């Protein structure tokens, strides 16, 4: 079994920005991470890596 | 990087991995500035620093760094305050077309632009080579204290 | 009648000793004072650091010695002595290797932004100095009343 | 009638690979063991750092490398093997790029506070070594049983 990890980053004046448009900033930086987990799933079954065996 | 992969790589003017960065926040910019590209301190005013775009005969200081509540026009404008990268990991702009040798020194000409490695002293390349639009973005690791004014 | 008046008075800038910013920043809290007196916005040098237990003893700058790093202020581990705050042979120190501070100054110039700090025997910045350092500048140039100041920048050595 | 007794043990300092100090330090993972193991207390090297990818491969230092970092002592990822603990093929290693860690030492005398470090072809210190970093010595030297250890200051690459 292996571990797979990312982050992001926000400020506070983006998160009030978010919160009075109406179109929020976190939930679009936090659906990246699932799509690059999913990615990198994707990459490790039907491609290998070598170093990792 | 483009097809064959659900997610572009990265975008330029934005760090890469969250290890030791530090960001000044009391800048004001001289002329337009865009993201990526190295800066020079013109002077110091009350406090703040007056950044430009990097010329000849001038010191890089950092790289510009993106923000989107600031800047709502995809580049820093004139008399607008801005965020420099002084210390960490960001994608920087460059005018090559093959990785240079690792932890190798980088060169810097133009618009603060990468033209070429094989340097002295200064910022290194770690490891990194995206493609973008029409060309390479390359990741610089920024460290303070590193390139020092020549005496006059 | 009579016509009212209302004044200002700015504040200073800072106080010598004193870390400028919030910026990355790093003081050694392990080391004792060897022999004599520091001042609080001098350098300091390594005299020996020990093997087993671990403490560093730190001393003042002299002739021909690499500085290591600038005392800070604090109010409860230093002592006033000479009208001024300083640190007494014995007890804890707190030197920052990292970081921005306010140092004492002789020089009577403002110097570039950049370019590479320079100290005399005393370890307090002088314009032509004798011992050369890595440390460079921060821009800040003030004055404290009758004390002049100016803004460094420091790194590990 | 009788004398009663009272004893006293000490317990010892460091741990090979061991983190020293809560200093600023930066510990990089995703980096993969390429080939053979790597121990605790070793420098190691980069063969390869993926473009696109990210990942670092890591493997032992050999004769005209370039060390990059101290493997890291951790109780998850590390796998126990020869009544040591080791790091196997084709796992994730905890490299220390700053900071001050224990390593392994081959040298017999106590080194200076403020000088260079000198590695073998092994990846152990030895104060005559080939192999040149940039990296400074912290002052720390013990021994734990029958191993020796010295403390040394890493600069970022």
Known sequence: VF??????????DEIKAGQATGRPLSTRKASACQLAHDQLVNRLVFKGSAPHK | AYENLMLRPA??????????????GACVAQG???FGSAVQVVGIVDGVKVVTALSDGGTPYGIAFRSQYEHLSGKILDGEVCNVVSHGRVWALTSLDEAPSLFSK?????????????GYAGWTFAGG?????DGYIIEVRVKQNAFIVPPP | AQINASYQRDMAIALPGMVADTSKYNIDGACVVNEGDVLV??????VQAQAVDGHKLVKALTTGTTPYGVAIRSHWQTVNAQNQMIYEDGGAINVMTSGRVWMLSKSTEAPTFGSAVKLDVDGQEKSDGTIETTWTYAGGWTKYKDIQLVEVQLHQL
């Open chain 2, 129 to 133: 080579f995206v493609k973008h639009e």
């Open chain 2, 32 to 34: 337009d500035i865009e």
């Open chain 2, 11 to 24: 975008c330029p003017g934005n760090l890469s991995d969250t290890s030791t960065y530090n960001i000044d």
């Open chain 2, 106 to 118: 980088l060169q810097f000409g133009s618009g603060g632009v990468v033209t070429g490695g094989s």
């Open chain 3, 41 to 46: 916005g001098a350098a300091v040098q390594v």
């Open chain 1, 3 to 12: 571990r797979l990890g990312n982050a992001y980053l926000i400020s506070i």
